[PDB]
Amino acid sequence: MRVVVIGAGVIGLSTALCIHERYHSVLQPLDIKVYADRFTPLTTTDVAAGLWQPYLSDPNNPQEADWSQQTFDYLLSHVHSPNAENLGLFLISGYNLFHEAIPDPSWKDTVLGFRKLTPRELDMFPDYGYGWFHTSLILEGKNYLQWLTERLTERGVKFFQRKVESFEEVAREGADVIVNCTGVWAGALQRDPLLQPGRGQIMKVDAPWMKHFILTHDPERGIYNSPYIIPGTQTVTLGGIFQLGNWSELNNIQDHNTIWEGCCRLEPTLKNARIIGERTGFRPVRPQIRLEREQLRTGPSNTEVIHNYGHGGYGLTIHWGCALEAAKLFGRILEEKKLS
Amino acid sequence: MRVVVIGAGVIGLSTALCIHERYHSVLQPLDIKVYADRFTPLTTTDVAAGLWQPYLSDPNNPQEADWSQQTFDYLLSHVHSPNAENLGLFLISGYNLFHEAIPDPSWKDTVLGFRKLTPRELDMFPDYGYGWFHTSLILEGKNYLQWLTERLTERGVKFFQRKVESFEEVAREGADVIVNCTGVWAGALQRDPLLQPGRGQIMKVDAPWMKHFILTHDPERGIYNSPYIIPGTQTVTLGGIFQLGNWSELNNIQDHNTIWEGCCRLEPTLKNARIIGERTGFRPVRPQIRLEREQLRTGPSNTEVIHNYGHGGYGLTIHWGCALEAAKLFGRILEEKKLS
Ligand SMILES: Cc1cc2nc3c(=O)[nH]c(=O)nc-3n(C[C@H](O)[C@H](O)[C@H](O)COP(=O)(O)OP(=O)(O)OC[C@H]3O[C@@H](n4cnc5c(N)ncnc54)[C@H](O)[C@@H]3O)c2cc1C
Ligand SMILES: Cc1cc2nc3c(=O)[nH]c(=O)nc-3n(C[C@H](O)[C@H](O)[C@H](O)COP(=O)(O)OP(=O)(O)OC[C@H]3O[C@@H](n4cnc5c(N)ncnc54)[C@H](O)[C@@H]3O)c2cc1C
């Protein structure tokens, strides 16, 4: 069975690894290749801080809540492992701040120690009257892509740098199954008017006294259009930009100033922090993830496709449950191939 | 009024600064000098990680609970200030772990967000069945001594390196008031059989993914004779040694191995952490702090003394309330000097 995974961000690499681990067998070996136009450190996944946190609103597809919890439980089970440093995986606590009262999120029982903030805690944040505290996990995107890449490479998965122009192009080279993990660019291989870029910009700063994340919200202005601060292993991410429809892969000074001034109002100690770097990326925004099989006609043959794209601002948070779901769909293909 | 403060750890410098700020006036200037045998980075204060946390047991003198709370409230009021980075001051959350249930500490309402740990949190710690989570503050000892030293120096307080052999020696040089802030060595200037060294040893390690403190307890073996892990700004402190009566200022390999093996059992990710440094210091253990006035006969004159020593494993935690108390005692001296 020749499988091609298109895409080498967290979704494509985790899906490739899950297909291999579940379905590369002694009596049915797979040949798996990854085709991608960009690899680490140059994907969207590489821009993400990697905090596990779904959106505040309930997902349109309720299975996505399961996939996020599966990812959390999976990662939590390994956070105290000696492997965790190579994954970029660690525990972190922090604040979610609101102007006024809001209902609890659906994921409040997935994270550890979820509670409302107390009055004395809220006194630390002059602009916010309500919020949460909990403990979650960070899975840093660059690190984890590097780790996934090493695991794939040691299992014989080969990687090729190319921009694919069509599913037919890949089918003509002999793929029996294509897994489409192309993030925000999926529309170029098959039009999808529900998929749009949600452009974000972040700054990385040296602020090693910051031991908590701090996410603020202004839901009417949209998720992530409010300051956020997320300590990583080496540096702290500052952000708070979400611009639907904007395809400019270029840091801009207006968004720089929005991020800096908003995060320094939130946390005045950041005025002393050295700015290390700045990045832009495109969240693959869709009303729900597209995670589903399709049969495509590709010249003289049909080809099986699994789509796995549209993970918005939560691709690291949900990737493992999606990758397991994609591998289940792959097993349905194999079961049907026996019954030819 | 000529004042000599003996001692340049956190107690002596904070007391000197509080006396200056409260009682150096236009119509009554003070001349304040600090005499010390060791200055930063070579004091006990420099060895301390600086987590605000009193002992678990209630203090013999209940005023000490007030002094600790005053210190916490003072520091918390400045933690989001642009001055905080120069003090070495930041917020941190973390765990206190026990084998079995224990009553809540008296300071549970001083810290932020105090709660019992949940079952799923306790599942992360195989050896512990009970514990707490809260948010506290770190005030790093070296940094804060440097900061106190700059504040004193800009106010004209002069520092002299010397070992003082007696209070009479200092009185003969013309001191009207001596403030005795000599930590564990106070017994050399006036015998105090209740004051003893509580020797500790720590290791500093590069583990920047550690965002929480983790303190374990085995109360029958004594406070701090159980593993602890405390992230600082740059490095993580590992410890867990408290040896009453031991005056050896020398890191030893047996205590090294106790610390390392106990902290790596607590947190297996530390097995990958690079060891940076190792230090020994002496906690000034006393059944209560000695914070009180004495009149001493010093040859032809009497001299006023304020004692401020005996702060055990909590000198950073309590220092500001003690320093304010010492300055109140200093004001009683001035009031009596008017009534000569
Ligand atoms: C500023 C920002 C912060 C974020 N923070 C977080 C966070 O803290 N937590 C969280 O859960 N998520 C976060 N996210 C979201 C997360 O980054 C995305 O959901 C996730 O990276 C999407 O992964 P992906 O693999 O689908 O896409 P990508 O990482 O973009 O990978 C897509 C791959 O497809 C390839 N490709 C596309 N089209 C073609 C083609 N035609 N031919 C060949 N290759 C092709 C690309 O080259 C690339 O290899 C953040 C995103 C942004 C922008
Ligand atoms: C391993 C360890 C970890 C700790 N962690 C923490 C923590 O996280 N939080 C917390 O609250 N506390 C902590 N502590 C406790 C804290 O370090 C002490 O309580 C505090 O430093 C005592 O301060 P001090 O100024 O009295 O003593 P010191 O810092 O020892 O200063 C005493 C001064 O007196 C001088 N001196 C003494 N005798 C003479 C003399 N005859 N002539 C001249 N000078 C003299 C010395 O040279 C020195 O300048 C820790 C202590 C240890 C050992």
Side-chain angles (χ1 to χ4, degrees), chain A residues 81-325:
Chain A
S81 180
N83 232 311
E85 201 209 345
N86 296 105
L87 276 86
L89 207 205
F90 61 92
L91 283 158
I92 192 175
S93 304
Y95 303 87
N96 276 267
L97 298 169
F98 303 88
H99 298 300
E100 305 183 307
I102 186 79
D104 294 354
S106 62
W107 45 262
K108 75 152 178 176
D109 294 296
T110 299
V111 297
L112 283 307
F114 185 93
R115 63 177 176 85
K116 323 276 185 171
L117 291 171
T118 68
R120 288 175 64 225
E121 289 172 290
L122 289 165
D123 295 339
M124 303 190 295
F125 303 106
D127 299 323
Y128 296 99
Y130 186 84
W132 312 322
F133 192 95
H134 70 269
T135 302
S136 189
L137 297 158
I138 277 170
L139 179 62
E140 303 192 309
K142 310 206 185 178
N143 247 82
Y144 188 51
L145 252 29
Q146 242 76 191
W147 183 88
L148 291 167
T149 298
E150 294 173 12
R151 246 74 286 138
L152 260 353
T153 295
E154 94 200 349
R155 289 160 172 72
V157 173
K158 303 303 173 187
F159 291 49
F160 303 88
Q161 196 263 322
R162 50 193 283 183
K163 173 169 176 257
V164 175
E165 301 296 333
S166 68
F167 297 120
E168 177 171 3
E169 168 197 337
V170 178
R172 292 299 105 240
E173 295 186 342
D176 302 303
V177 184
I178 301 165
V179 189
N180 176 214
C181 305
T182 46
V184 69
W185 296 279
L189 295 177
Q190 171 186 112
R191 299 192 321 129
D192 182 356
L194 310 176
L195 179 67
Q196 297 174 344
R199 180 185 173 277
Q201 185 180 318
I202 55 150
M203 200 181 298
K204 302 300 204 202
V205 86
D206 188 20
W209 60 91
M210 293 295 284
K211 304 303 189 193
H212 301 98
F213 60 80
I214 312 169
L215 269 58
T216 66
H217 300 276
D218 183 345
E220 265 185 5
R221 304 186 94 171
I223 190 71
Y224 311 129
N225 276 313
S226 188
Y228 64 73
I229 303 169
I230 308 175
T233 58
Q234 298 289 161
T235 187
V236 172
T237 297
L238 275 27
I241 301 294
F242 196 138
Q243 288 152 356
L244 288 168
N246 185 339
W247 280 106
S248 177
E249 192 171 12
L250 158 67
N251 303 324
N252 72 83
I253 197 64
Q254 182 173 186
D255 296 342
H256 174 105
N257 298 141
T258 295
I259 296 314
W260 186 249
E261 294 172 17
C263 295
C264 291
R265 175 161 175 154
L266 223 199
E267 171 60 77
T269 68
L270 266 33
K271 296 158 70 175
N272 283 24
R274 172 178 53 130
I275 301 169
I276 305 296
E278 175 142 50
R279 292 294 312 269
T280 292
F282 304 111
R283 301 173 190 92
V285 175
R286 197 171 187 276
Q288 66 185 204
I289 292 158
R290 191 177 182 201
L291 176 42
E292 65 189 22
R293 283 178 66 194
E294 191 173 20
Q295 340 294 146
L296 256 33
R297 302 196 195 156
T298 51
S301 192
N302 272 69
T303 201
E304 302 292 318
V305 179
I306 297 167
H307 296 288
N308 189 5
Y309 73 80
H311 303 75
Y314 59 95
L316 281 156
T317 292
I318 201 169
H319 74 281
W320 194 243
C322 294
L324 293 170
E325 172 72 19

